[PDB]
Design a protein around this ligand. Structure first.
Ligand SMILES: [Ca+2]
Ligand SMILES: [Ca+2]
Length: 279
């Protein structure tokens, strides 16, 4: 399948070079996989989700995404126009408030919720969790992310936007999950992206167009935008049978575009998520 005039990040995921505009991908499109977006919620009614999104848990007064961030991230995972895995099932877990903030106890509870809830959902091709969030180092947050991964979920987490070593941020610093840095359309490390030995992969994160609340769209930037490209890629590859929740991060690193990015500090991977789609 081919999507012409796609958002640059989707085109980048399916190319060995920057500057292309078509997103090439297998038509299976993540069908049969499930991605939990642990964030501010998901506006499931957005036409771009096509009935494939639903809220399954909220830690706040409402399940509504009153911010937009979670809807944007969910759109990069799996919306029709803006998503990597255009036929996946999306599940929203609202651990962040409508200002985009959340206590670590709540974020932890949301991870534990997913580890359990997935046993009640039909996800034959596997389960992914996308965590476009984090703050300072916390062993408890890292342990929660490690538990979620160990339970059989492909966990993708943002590296953080501090232009610093991700070792000091959580859940970014948990080694066992897939820690995602951000790049721009010219294959530079995004200005704000964290780096360091704990990063597993980079994905598109600067100027990413996706869904927003009120049935709208907008472009924003962050390691929060890179993360769902990797989560969606994992779901897509799991549907194709190429990898599993336990092995997807490693598989994505194995098959990434290597050495393409600039301003990568020595000791940080120079690996950019790539679907290796061959029509
Ligand atoms: Ca290249
Ligand atoms: Ca890792």
């Amino acid at each position: 399948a081919a999507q012409t005039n796609a958002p640059w990040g989707l085109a980048r995921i399916s190319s060995t070079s920057p500057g292309t505009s078509t997103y090439y991908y297998d038509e299976s499109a993540g069908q049969g996989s499930c991605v939990y977006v642990i964030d501010t919620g998901i506006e499931a009614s957005h036409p771009e989700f096509e009935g494939r999104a639903q809220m399954v848990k909220t830690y706040y007064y409402s399940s509504r995404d009153g911010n937009g961030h979670g809807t944007h991230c969910a759109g990069t995972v799996g919306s029709r126009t803006y998503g990597v895995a255009k036929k996946t099932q999306l599940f929203g877990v609202k651990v962040l408030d409508d200002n985009g903030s959340g206590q670590y106890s709540t974020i932890i509870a949301g991870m534990d919720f997913v580890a359990s809830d997935k046993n009640n959902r039909n996800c034959p091709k596997g389960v992914v969790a996308s965590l476009s969030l984090g703050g300072g180092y916390s062993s408890s947050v890292n342990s929660a992310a490690a538990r979620l991964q160990s339970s059989g979920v492909m966990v993708a987490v943002a590296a953080g936007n501090n232009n610093a070593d991700a070792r000091n941020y959580s859940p970014a610093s948990e080694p066992s999950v897939c820690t995602v840095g951000a790049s721009d359309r010219y294959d530079r490390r995004s200005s704000f992206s964290n780096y360091g030995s704990v990063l597993d992969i980079f994905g598109p994160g600067t100027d990413i167009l996706s869904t927003w609340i009120g049935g709208s769209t907008r472009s924003i930037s962050g390691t929060s935008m890179a993360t769902p490209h990797v989560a969606g890629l994992a779901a897509y590859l799991m549907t194709l049978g190429k990898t599993t929740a336990a092995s997807a991060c490693r598989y994505i690193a194995d098959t990434a575009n290597k050495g393409d990015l600039s301003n990568i500090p020595f000791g940080t991977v120079n690996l950019l998520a790539y679907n290796n789609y061959q029509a």
